[PDB]
């Protein structure tokens, strides 16, 4: 089966992320990163306030269906 995660950008973009529960969240981060055409070191993914690691997974973070993910941008200074 597939899980649908709600990733929203600060611009108000909602992406229909069709991913599984065992698929690494790292791939998810890169996907949106490439989608908008930005660098992975430029954006920060937060799940329920907690930052998502490259070793994290939906099944690990106990992410349920229709779970929301916030994407912040790295401060320049």
């Amino acid at each position: 089966d597939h899980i649908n995660l709600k990733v929203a950008g600060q611009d108000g973009s909602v992406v229909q992320f069709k991913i599984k529960r065992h698929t690494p969240l790292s791939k998810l981060m890169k996907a949106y990163c490439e989608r908008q055409g930005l660098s992975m070191r430029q954006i920060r993914f937060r799940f329920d306030g907690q930052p998502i690691n490259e070793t994290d997974t939906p099944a690990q973070l106990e992410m349920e269906d229709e779970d929301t993910i916030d994407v912040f941008q790295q401060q320049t200074g």
């Binding site: 611009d11 108000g12 973009s13 909602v14 992406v15 229909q16 992320f17 069709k18 991913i19 599984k20 065992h22 698929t23 791939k27 998810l28 996907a31 949106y32 989608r35």
Partner: peptide, 12 residues
């Protein structure tokens, strides 16, 4: 409403 669709590839 702005919607962007992303499909993920999962390795078996």
């Amino acid at each position: 409403n702005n919607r962007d669709p992303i499909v993920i590839s999962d390795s078996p």
